[PDB]
Amino acid sequence: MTTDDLAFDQRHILHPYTSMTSPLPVYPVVSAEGCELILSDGRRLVDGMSSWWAAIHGYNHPQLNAAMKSQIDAMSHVMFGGITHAPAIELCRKLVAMTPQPLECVFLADSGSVAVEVAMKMALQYWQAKGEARQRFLTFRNGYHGDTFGAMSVCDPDNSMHSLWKGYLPENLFAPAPQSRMDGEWDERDMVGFARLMAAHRHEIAAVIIEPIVQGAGGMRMYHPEWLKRIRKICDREGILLIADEIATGFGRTGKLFACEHAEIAPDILCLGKALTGGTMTLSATLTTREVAETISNGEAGCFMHGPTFMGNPLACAAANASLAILESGDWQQQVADIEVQLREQLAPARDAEMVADVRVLGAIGVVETTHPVNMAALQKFFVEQGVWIRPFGKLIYLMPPYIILPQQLQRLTAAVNRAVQDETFFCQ
Amino acid sequence: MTTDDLAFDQRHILHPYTSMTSPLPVYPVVSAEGCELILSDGRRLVDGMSSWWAAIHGYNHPQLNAAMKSQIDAMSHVMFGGITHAPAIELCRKLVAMTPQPLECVFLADSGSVAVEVAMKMALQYWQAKGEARQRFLTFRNGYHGDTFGAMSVCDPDNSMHSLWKGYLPENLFAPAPQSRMGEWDERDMVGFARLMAAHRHEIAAVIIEPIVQGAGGMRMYHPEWLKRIRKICDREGILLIADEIATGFGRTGKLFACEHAEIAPDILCLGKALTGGTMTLSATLTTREVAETISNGEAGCFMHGPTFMGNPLACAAANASLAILESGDWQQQVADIEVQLREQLAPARDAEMVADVRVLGAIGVVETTHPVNMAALQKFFVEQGVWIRPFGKLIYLMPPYIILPQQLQRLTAAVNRAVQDETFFCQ
Numbered sequence: 001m002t003t004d005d006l007a008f009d010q011r012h013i014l015h016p017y018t019s020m021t022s023p024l025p026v027y028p029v030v031s032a033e034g035c036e037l038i039l040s041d042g043r044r045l046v047d048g049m050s051s052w053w054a055a056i057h058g059y060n061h062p063q064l065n066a067a068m069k070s071q072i073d074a075m076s077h078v079m080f081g082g083i084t085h086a087p088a089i090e091l092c093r094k095l096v097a098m099t100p101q102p103l104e105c106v107f108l109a110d111s112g113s114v115a116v117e118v119a120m121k122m123a124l125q126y127w128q129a130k131g132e133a134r135q136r137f138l139t140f141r142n143g144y145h146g147d148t149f150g151a152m153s154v155c156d157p158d159n160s161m162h163s164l165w166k167g168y169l170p171e172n173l174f175a176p177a178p179q180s181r182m183d184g185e186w187d188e189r190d191m192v193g194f195a196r197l198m199a200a201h202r203h204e205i206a207a208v209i210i211e212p213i214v215q216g217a218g219g220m221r222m223y224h225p226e227w228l229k230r231i232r233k234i235c236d237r238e239g240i241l242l243i244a245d246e247i248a249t250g251f252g253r254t255g256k257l258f259a260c261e262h263a264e265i266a267p268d269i270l271c272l273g274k275a276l277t278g279g280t281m282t283l284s285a286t287l288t289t290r291e292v293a294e295t296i297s298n299g300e301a302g303c304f305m306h307g308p309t310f311m312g313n314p315l316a317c318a319a320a321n322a323s324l325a326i327l328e329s330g331d332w333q334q335q336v337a338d339i340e341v342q343l344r345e346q347l348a349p350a351r352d353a354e355m356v357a358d359v360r361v362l363g364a365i366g367v368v369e370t371t372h373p374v375n376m377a378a379l380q381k382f383f384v385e386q387g388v389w390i391r392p393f394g395k396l397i398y399l400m401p402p403y404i405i406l407p408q409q410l411q412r413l414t415a416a417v418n419r420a421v422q423d424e425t426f427f428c429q
Numbered sequence: 430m431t432t433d434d435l436a437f438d439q440r441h442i443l444h445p446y447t448s449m450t451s452p453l454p455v456y457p458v459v460s461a462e463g464c465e466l467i468l469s470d471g472r473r474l475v476d477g478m479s480s481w482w483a484a485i486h487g488y489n490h491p492q493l494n495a496a497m498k499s500q501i502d503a504m505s506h507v508m509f510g511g512i513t514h515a516p517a518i519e520l521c522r523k524l525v526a527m528t529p530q531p532l533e534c535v536f537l538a539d540s541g542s543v544a545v546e547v548a549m550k551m552a553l554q555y556w557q558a559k560g561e562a563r564q565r566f567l568t569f570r571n572g573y574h575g576d577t578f579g580a581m582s583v584c585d586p587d588n589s590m591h592s593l594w595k596g597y598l599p600e601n602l603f604a605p606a607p608q609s610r611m612g613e614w615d616e617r618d619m620v621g622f623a624r625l626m627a628a629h630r631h632e633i634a635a636v637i638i639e640p641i642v643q644g645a646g647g648m649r650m651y652h653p654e655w656l657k658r659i660r661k662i663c664d665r666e667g668i669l670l671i672a673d674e675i676a677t678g679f680g681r682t683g684k685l686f687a688c689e690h691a692e693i694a695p696d697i698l699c700l701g702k703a704l705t706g707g708t709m710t711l712s713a714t715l716t717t718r719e720v721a722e723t724i725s726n727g728e729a730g731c732f733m734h735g736p737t738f739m740g741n742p743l744a745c746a747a748a749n750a751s752l753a754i755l756e757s758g759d760w761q762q763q764v765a766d767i768e769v770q771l772r773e774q775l776a777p778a779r780d781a782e783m784v785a786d787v788r789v790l791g792a793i794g795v796v797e798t799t800h801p802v803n804m805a806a807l808q809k810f811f812v813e814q815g816v817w818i819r820p821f822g823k824l825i826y827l828m829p830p831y832i833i834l835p836q837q838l839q840r841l842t843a844a845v846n847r848a849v850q851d852e853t854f855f856c857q
């Protein structure tokens with residue numbers, strides 16, 4: 001990589017949610033292995049992010065690599081219209097067996113946002129087949145479900161700047177963000193907002209959609225499992241579908257295989273992404289019940305009206321199957337449990353730092369919320385100089401390391417977070 | 430694959446736009462090579478579809494394979510927030526260099542539908558930043574732009590069954606489907622489009638169309654004068670033009686981009702499918718400096734979108750390798766020879782009782798039928814003829830890999846002609 005290559009990237013290549021006229025520095029990565037990212041200049045960094053949740057087995061994993069290359073030798077891709085193949089069947093078998101019993105019908109797709117769109121369309125088509133005028137979604141504030149139009153319509157309106165699209169996006173129902181903590185006690189006052197909305201709009205709600213236990217991109221919030229139990233039963237009593245968006249929480253990150261297990265509930269529709277392929281490449285899956293899948297097919301259309309070009313991509317399914325096979329050992333349970341204790345113990349000191357507002361840990365997720373916004377360019381430089389890849393945002397300095405991280409590597413990450421928050425050097429902007 | 434594996438697929442796995450309560454047969458593919466798919470029973474099928482447009486270089490291509498394996502060796506994926514990498518920079522260099530001059534800012538995404546959602550959000554954010562109340566899209570009937578909700582809102586309302594979602598989808602503007610054929614130009618074809626532009630020019634964010642070929646919406650092929658006129662109209666009104674070339678891009682119609690047929694540049698270009706050589710999903714939305722800077726100087730301070738796997742190194746490496754095959758220029762004469770053979774060999778379908786129309790453009794050949802096909806029976810007929818042709822509704826069409834041999838292409842056209850001789854494979 002040359003400096004001319006880096007100038008071209010700055011001038012011509014958009015990156016996720018960041019200015020093109022005032023872009024901040026991007027670091028050139030040439031390769032990755034184990035729990036490390038290797039920069040163009042040779043500097044090695046301990047990855048604290050799993051490339052945003054997904055790389056739960058780290059990088060260049062022997063089993064994922066071997067399965068991907070083996071699938072390339074068979075066929076990287078073939079269409080799924082009128083065709084089926086082993087990678088898709090194996091993957092769907094595994095997804096059906098590892099999720100709650102009622103979830104036995106799988107719609108594979110290309111990204112998390114598309115999986116959410118699929119879920120929302122299944123809820124809308126479901127009710128249309130039943131002859132009921134249900135088109136509204138009840139969700140929580142601080143929620144994040146993706147960047148496409150449908151997904152955006154259930155994302156937090158303030159966080160996502162819905163004023164930009166006011167009049168274009170459909171207006172859904174937003175209950176207050178859950179207050180009771182995963183760490184703490186249950187507070188029944190938490191339910192009043194949700195109850196009031198359900199009471200007023202019960203007859204037009206197609207589905208409730210939430211991120212179970214952890215609200216990721218909307219605030220790295222960790223709430224009490226009683227909420228899901230309460231929501232499930234309200235949905236059961238009212239006849240409303242429950243959509244659980246586990247695109248960030250799925251595949252053991254919160255300490256359980258699926259975060260819905262924390263409440264011992266099953267949704268009607270389940271969305272999965274990120275970590276599904278072990279963070280090797282994009283893929284997603286939307287699982288639903290037979291009741292939903294057949295009801296839609298019996299309606300006017302005669303089928304569920306969705307079908308992406310690369311649906312069922314053999315290469316991504318073979319990578320996902322290898323990733324799930326590693327999880328079948330159950331080793332992730334102990335790894336995640338160990339990461340959780342180390343994050344609790346090592347981020348605990350940060351509660352006394354003057355820049356820190358809160359410290360919360362769940363599974364392989366460790367969050368240090370600050371009182372003021374971080375200075376993105378300065379703090380990112382600091383982390384890179386400490387030999388760590390930690391990508392902060394707003395007032396959140398968080399870690400979600402690969403499950404294979406070593407204790408020495410995890411300690412370098414926590415040491416860096418604590419050092420970052422000791423004074424105001426890297427704060428505001 | 431066992432018999433039980435196939436039963437599991439039937440009852441538990443959804444497939445594109447097909448019933449779960451009356452599932453129709455699916456064929457188990459174990460591998461693919463050159464221009465052939467290999468079934469589990471060992472039967473080899475000539476692929477007439479390119480796995481829906483994308484596999485323009487066929488399957489198990491040695492160059493595509495080596496490039497993907499090599500990138501797996503470096504890293505298959507790393508996040509793009511705060512990071513960049515060589516596969517992404519090389520792909521963006523190629524995309525900017527090969528598209529019209531003004532198109533120089535690339536937003537990589539994961540699928541065609543997302544690339545269209547991105548294009549639509551660019552247009553909306555662009556006008557929001559300029560302080561103009563513009564939220565309508567003007568499009569053509571019979572268009573297809575994807576399956577996510579924003580993309581669905583500009584898809585043909587009849588074809589895409591908008592009654593299913595009436596009230597959830599924003600209401601856009603639909604001009605008549607272009608009549609003039611790819612054929613003589615009729616000035617009256619423009620009336621409908623002009624009427625809508627006159628009444629809503631103050632409110633239109635962008636015009637969005639599939640240039641020259643309307644794909645999933647009917648495999649329609651229209652006159653390039655339409656694009657010339659639409660570009661001029663957009664310019665005069667200051668409206669953005671979005672060209673969706675997710676199906677037409679990378680040589681399929683005979684030109685590298687179908688916008689070239691009119692020598693026009695859109696303000697926003699969407700690319701997908703064939704971008705990776707049909708190896709895996711990836712998409713890209715290109716726009717101009719004017720659009721991209723204006724958005725970033727607005728209140729959000731950036732373009733508000735960023736998928737988890739944005740810029741995925743593995744898919745970018747596959748697209749770079751696919752584009753490096755096209756750089757040879759061999760596709761130009763390959764597509765030109767395919768077009769001749771399609772014209773010559775689908776000509777006889779004009780003597781068949783079940784045909785309504787025959788139309789060819791570049792490496793696309795379409796036989797429109799009078800009655801809907803019987804999907805299960807016709808699919809099986811094709812499989813038995815040693816070919817993989819996937820029809821839908823009243824269309825039996827071919828879009829083969831550019832490397833297809835004349836003898837393989839002949840087996841496909843012969844099979845199509847045989848299927849349209851009488852009513853056997855029609856209705857259901």
Ligand SMILES: *Cc1c(COP(=O)(O)O)cnc(C)c1O
Nearest residue numbers: 111112113145146247248736737
């Ligand atoms: C990441 C994420 C999404 C969107 O996934 P993409 O692959 O970015 O489109 C959806 N929902 C949640 C909860 C996520 O974390």
Ligand SMILES: *Cc1c(COP(=O)(O)O)cnc(C)c1O
Nearest residue numbers: 308309540541542574575675676
């Ligand atoms: C294929 C197609 C799309 C949608 O792409 P997906 O990858 O299926 O989401 C959008 N536009 C056109 C013109 C296409 O042909």
Ligand SMILES: [K+]
Nearest residue numbers: 096099100103
């Ligand atoms: K299940």
Ligand SMILES: [K+]
Nearest residue numbers: 525528529532
């Ligand atoms: K260009």
